[PDB]
Scaffold this active site. Structure first.
Site, PDB file in Angstrom:
ATOM      1  N   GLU A  83       0.838  -1.183   0.000  1.00 46.14           N
ATOM      2  CA  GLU A  83       0.000   0.000   0.000  1.00 46.14           C
ATOM      3  C   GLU A  83       0.876   1.237   0.000  1.00 46.14           C
ATOM      4  O   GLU A  83       0.594   2.208  -0.700  1.00 46.14           O
ATOM      5  CB  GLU A  83      -0.898   0.054   1.219  1.00 46.14           C
ATOM      6  CG  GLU A  83      -1.717   1.333   1.238  1.00 46.14           C
ATOM      7  CD  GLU A  83      -2.225   1.703   2.603  1.00 46.14           C
ATOM      8  OE1 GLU A  83      -2.237   0.819   3.491  1.00 46.14           O
ATOM      9  OE2 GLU A  83      -2.615   2.884   2.777  1.00 46.14           O
ATOM     10  N   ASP A  94       0.574   3.542  -3.247  1.00 47.66           N
ATOM     11  CA  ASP A  94       0.112   4.909  -3.008  1.00 47.66           C
ATOM     12  C   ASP A  94       0.990   5.870  -3.789  1.00 47.66           C
ATOM     13  O   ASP A  94       0.503   6.709  -4.531  1.00 47.66           O
ATOM     14  CB  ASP A  94       0.150   5.261  -1.519  1.00 47.66           C
ATOM     15  CG  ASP A  94      -0.337   6.688  -1.238  1.00 47.66           C
ATOM     16  OD1 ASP A  94      -1.054   7.264  -2.081  1.00 47.66           O
ATOM     17  OD2 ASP A  94      -0.023   7.232  -0.163  1.00 47.66           O
ATOM     18  N   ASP A 103      -7.149   0.950   0.587  1.00 46.95           N
ATOM     19  CA  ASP A 103      -5.800   0.445   0.814  1.00 46.95           C
ATOM     20  C   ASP A 103      -5.492  -0.718  -0.120  1.00 46.95           C
ATOM     21  O   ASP A 103      -4.353  -0.880  -0.550  1.00 46.95           O
ATOM     22  CB  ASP A 103      -5.612  -0.018   2.266  1.00 46.95           C
ATOM     23  CG  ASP A 103      -5.612   1.131   3.266  1.00 46.95           C
ATOM     24  OD1 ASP A 103      -5.513   2.306   2.845  1.00 46.95           O
ATOM     25  OD2 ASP A 103      -5.697   0.850   4.486  1.00 46.95           O
ATOM     26  N   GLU A 120      -4.614   0.569  -3.614  1.00 49.07           N
ATOM     27  CA  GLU A 120      -3.225   1.028  -3.634  1.00 49.07           C
ATOM     28  C   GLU A 120      -2.236  -0.135  -3.583  1.00 49.07           C
ATOM     29  O   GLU A 120      -1.228  -0.120  -4.287  1.00 49.07           O
ATOM     30  CB  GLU A 120      -2.950   2.028  -2.501  1.00 49.07           C
ATOM     31  CG  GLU A 120      -3.617   3.399  -2.701  1.00 49.07           C
ATOM     32  CD  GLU A 120      -3.595   4.268  -1.442  1.00 49.07           C
ATOM     33  OE1 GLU A 120      -3.405   3.735  -0.328  1.00 49.07           O
ATOM     34  OE2 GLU A 120      -3.761   5.497  -1.569  1.00 49.07           O
TER      35      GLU A 120
HETATM   36 MG   LIG Z   1      -3.343   4.760   1.674  1.00 49.97          MG
END
Ligand SMILES: [Mg+2]
Ligand SMILES: [Mg+2]
Lengths: 239, 304
Positions: free
Chosen positions: B123, B127, B190, B193
Site C-alpha cells: 500500500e 500509493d 488500501d 493502492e
Molecule cells: Mg493509503
C-alpha cells in the site's frame, strides 16, 4: 550538436537496455519454449486456442525460432554490452534528458504574476515539471526503500523516504549536482526562499527525465487508471 | 495453471510491447541511420570516436544490418500485433499481476515475517505509484494546465473516497472477505493502492533504471544508516590526591572547535577526548579514565 550526440546516445543505449531485457523474457517465457511446461493445448475450452493464435505467440515463436540465425542475447554479450556503465558517462554528471528544451524548461524559475498569454507561460516555468517530478521522485524512492529493506514496516519505509525527499535534503542534492552553476544568469545571488527554488529544480529535472523515459513498461497500468478516471477527467472544468 | 497461462501471457505480451517499442527506437536512431544526420566523424579524440566504439553502437548497427533477414517492425505488423488490446482480455477484468502470491498479499490486512503477511508495504508503494501515474496522466492529458489545476485534478482521483468507488467497481469488496462476517472504507482504498503496488513490482524493469540507480546513489548516506557531568569531579575524588603526589590536570591540544583535551597526572598521560567545547572534552576524557579500572588502581590512594 555534441550535446545532441550524447543525448541521442543515451536514448539509444536505454532502448538497447530494454531490448536486451525484453528479448530475454521472450526467449524464456514458458508459453513460448518447446517444453510447454504449462501444457498449452490442454484446456477444454477455447482459451488455449486463443493464446496460441495471438499475434503475441506468433511473434514470440518466430523470434525464438530465429536464434540460430541471430541470437540477440549472444549479440549483447558478444560486444560486452553493459547496462549501467558506458564510455560516454565521463562526458556527463547525472542522467541525461533527451530533449534540450525539456531540460531547459526544468531550470526555468516560476515567476509570480503583460506580455505572454498564460498557456505559453506554462511553457516558460518549471512548475508543471516540478509537479510531475515530485510525484515520481516519491514513487522511485518508495521503490528503492521497498526493495532495499524487504523487512521494514510502513513506518520505517515512510521515515526513510521522508528523510530523502524533504526540501532540505533536495537542496543538498542540488548543491552536489552543481545546480548553482546552472542557474547563473544576469542577476547575482548575494537562504530561505533560495533553498526552496533549488529543490524545485531537482524535482523538475526528475520530471523531465520521466517525460523522456516514459514508454510502455507501465502503459497497461496507466491506460487502466485513465479508463477508470475518465468521468473525473472529463470534468476538465477547472481548465 | 489456467491462471498461470494467463499470467505468463501478459508477462510475455508486455515484453513484446517493450521489444517492439525499443526496436523502432534502435532502427531509427540518428546515430545509427546511414544518412548520418548528426555527422559522426572519424576524428580520434572526440565524442564521435567514443560513441562509435561503444558496445551500444555495435549492437545497434548489427541489428539494423540484419533487417533484410528479419525485420522486427515488419514481424509485428505482419501478425497484426496490437499493444493495448489482445484476445486474452476477454478472460480478465483488470491488469494482471504476474506473481500470484504477490497478488494475494495485496488483499491481506493487519516479526519481520509479519511484514510479509499484510498489504501495508504494498500500500505504501502503490500509493506512491498511483500518485506518479496519475500525475503523468494529467500532465500529458492537459498540457496547458498549471500546477494548481494538475494537483486538483489528481487529488480528485487519488483520494480515499474515489479509491473506495474503484474497489467497488473492481469487486475488491468480495476479495477482502473471509471467515468472519469510513474505517472499513479506508481498508478498501488500501487494497486498491496495494494492488497497484503489486502491478508495479511485477513490471518495474529498465525503463527508469538509470534514474532509480542515480537516486539510490545520491541517497546512499541516508540509506546506509552519552555524557557525565559528574565525570571531572568523580575523577578528582579518586585522583586529585594520588600515589604519585603529582597534579591531576587537563591539557588542551586543539584550541579551535575540534577540541582535544588530555587528562594527566603530572607528565603522565591518563587519557584524551576530542570534545566539542573544552568542558565537554574534559568530561569525556575523564569518562575514559573513570572506566579504566587498572589506571585507577595504579594511581588512586584508596581501594575500590
Ligand atoms: Mg493509503
Ligand atoms: Mg516541490
Amino acid at each position: 550538436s555534441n550535446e545532441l550526440k550524447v543525448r541521442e546516445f543515451y536514448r539509444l543505449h536505454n532502448a538497447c537496455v530494454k531490448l536486451k531485457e525484453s528479448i530475454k523474457l521472450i526467449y524464456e517465457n514458458p508459453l513460448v519454449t518447446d517444453q510447454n511446461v504449462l501444457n498449452l493445448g490442454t484446456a477444454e475450452n477455447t482459451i488455449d486456442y486463443t493464446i496460441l493464435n495471438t499475434p503475441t505467440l506468433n511473434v514470440a515463436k518466430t523470434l525464438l525460432g530465429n536464434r540460430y540465425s541471430l541470437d540477440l542475447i549472444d549479440l549483447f554479450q558478444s560486444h560486452d554490452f553493459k547496462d549501467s556503465n558506458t564510455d560516454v558517462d565521463m562526458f556527463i554528471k547525472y542522467p541525461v534528458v533527451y530533449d534540450e528544451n525539456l531540460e531547459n524548461l526544468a531550470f526555468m524559475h516560476k515567476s509570480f504574476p503583460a506580455h505572454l498569454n498564460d498557456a505559453q507561460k506554462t511553457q516558460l516555468s518549471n512548475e508543471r515539471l516540478e509537479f510531475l517530478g515530485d510525484s515520481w521522485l516519491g514513487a522511485l524512492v518508495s521503490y528503492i526503500v521497498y526493495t532495499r529493506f524487504p523487512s521494514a514496516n510502513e513506518g520505517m519505509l515512510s521515515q526513510m523516504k521522508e528523510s530523502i525527499v524533504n526540501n532540505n535534503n533536495l537542496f543538498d542534492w542540488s548543491t552536489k549536482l552543481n545546480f548553482t552553476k546552472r542557474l547563473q544568469g544576469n542577476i547575482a545571488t548575494p537562504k530561505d526562499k533560495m533553498s526552496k527554488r533549488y529543490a524545485d529544480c531537482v524535482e523538475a529535472y526528475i520530471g523531465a527525465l520521466v517525460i523522456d523515459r516514459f514508454g510502455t513498461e507501465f502503459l497497461d497500468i496507466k491506460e487502466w487508471l485513465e479508463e477508470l478516471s475518465e468521468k473525473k477527467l472529463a470534468k476538465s472544468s477547472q481548465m
